From Swiss-Prot:
Protein name (record): Cementoblastoma-derived protein 1
GN (gene name): CEMP1
Function: May play a role in development of the periodontium which surrounds and supports the teeth by promoting the differentiation of multi-potent cells from the periodontal ligament into cementoblasts to form the cementum. Binds hydroxyapatite and may promote the biomineralization of the cementum. Also promotes cell proliferation.
Organism: Homo sapiens (Human)
Recorded superkingdom: Eukaryota
Tissue specificity remark: Expressed by cementoblasts, a subpopulation of periodontal ligament cells and cells located around vessels in periodontium (at protein level).
Post-translational modification: Phosphorylated.
Induction: Up-regulated by hypoxia (at protein level).
Biased composition (Polar residues): 1-20
Shown part of the complete sequence: 1 to 20 of 247
């Protein structure tokens, strides 16, 4: 709940190494 511009992709691709 909260992925305006960071879905499972952007979040699970080019995101921090701690689910920031």
């Amino acid at each position: 709940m909260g992925t305006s511009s960071t879905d499972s992709q952007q979040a699970g691709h080019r995101r921090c190494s701690t689910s920031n």
